Design a binder for this molecule. Structure first.
Ligand SMILES: [Ca+2]
Ligand SMILES: [Ca+2]
Ligand SMILES: [Cu+2]
Ligand SMILES: [Cu+2]
Ligand SMILES: [Zn+2]
Ligand SMILES: [Zn+2]
Lengths: 151, 151
C-alpha cells in the first residue's frame, strides 16, 4: 500500500481527515483538522486500531523500537511521534508532515493503527517529568481514527 | 498481526463490533451486530479502509484474485465475500465465521480495509443479473468500519 487515509472523530467537535502517501522512503501526511483550540496539539500514531472504547483503546504511541518519546526530528522517538499540529484562531490545523520513520508497509506499517490528535501540545519529551518521556504530556485524546488503505 | 477488530457504524441504528483472530492457518471472525432488520444481510470486506464518504468510499469487494462474486463456500468468489449474517427478530446478528481466504497479513490481509454490513441478503453470485456477479444484490451499506490491529 502506498496511500492511506484516516478520518478523525471523537466525543467532541474535533474532526478531520488525514491522507498519507508513500513518496520514496518517506510518508507525506496531509489533511486538515478542525474544531481545535488554537495552538499546538500532540499528533501521534498510537499502537492499536481498536476504537471499541473510543480513543482510549488505541493504546500507547506506536513504538516498535522501544525508544522514548521524542519529536519527529529526533533519533530517539517513538515511530508514531509526529510532533504537533497547530490550530489557528479558527481552530483549524493544516497537516503537512513528511516522515521518514512511519511507513505504509513492512514492520513500521501504520495501516490498521490509530492517528490520535491531542488536547495539549506535545512537549517533545523535553518536559522534565517522566510523563514527558512517555507521551510528551499531550494530555487527552480529542479525536482519532483507524488508518485505512486508500485508493 | 494476529488479532484485528472493527467497529461498525453507519448513518442509522446499525452498529456492532467484529473481531478477527488468526487461529492456526485460518481466520476466525466473531462479534455481533444490532439494529438490523430480521433476516439475512450481506457481509463483505470492501477494498478500501476509506471512510471519508461514509461506507461509499470503501470501494468494491476486496478481490485480489479478480474473480466474480460468490458465497464464502464457492471457489469463484471475491476474497471479501463472507456471505450473509442473520439478524434475529430483535435485529441482532451473531457473527461466527471461519474463512480460508482472508488473512491478517500478506497479500490477503484485510487490515486497513472496511467491513460492510448490507441492507439486503447477498444472493451469493446466483441471482442471474450482472449485479449479482459484483455485489450479490446486497444493496446499500448500512454500517461499516476500518479493520484495525487489536491487542
Ligand atoms: Ca488533558
Ligand atoms: Ca439497498
Ligand atoms: Cu498521542
Ligand atoms: Cu459488500
Ligand atoms: Zn511518543
Ligand atoms: Zn463480492
Amino acid at each position: 500500500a502506498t496511500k492511506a487515509v484516516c478520518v478523525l472523530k471523537g466525543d467532541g467537535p474535533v474532526q478531520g481527515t488525514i491522507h498519507f502517501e508513500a513518496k520514496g522512503d518517506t510518508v507525506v501526511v496531509t489533511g486538515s483538522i478542525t474544531g481545535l483550540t488554537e495552538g499546538d496539539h500532540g499528533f501521534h500514531v498510537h499502537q492499536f486500531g481498536d476504537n471499541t472504547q473510543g480513543c482510549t483503546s488505541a493504546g500507547p504511541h506506536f513504538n516498535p523500537l522501544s525508544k522514548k518519546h521524542g519529536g519527529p526530528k529526533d533519533e530517539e522517538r517513538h515511530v508514531g511521534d509526529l510532533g504537533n499540529v497547530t490550530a489557528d484562531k479558527n481552530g483549524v490545523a493544516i497537516v503537512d508532515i513528511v516522515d521518514p520513520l512511519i511507513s505504509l508497509s513492512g514492520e513500521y506499517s501504520i495501516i490498521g493503527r490509530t492517528m490520535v490528535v491531542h488536547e495539549k501540545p506535545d512537549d517533545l519529551g523535553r518536559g522534565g517529568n517522566e510523563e514527558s518521556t512517555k507521551t510528551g504530556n499531550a494530555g487527552s485524546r480529542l479525536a482519532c481514527g483507524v488508518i485505512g488503505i486508500a485508493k
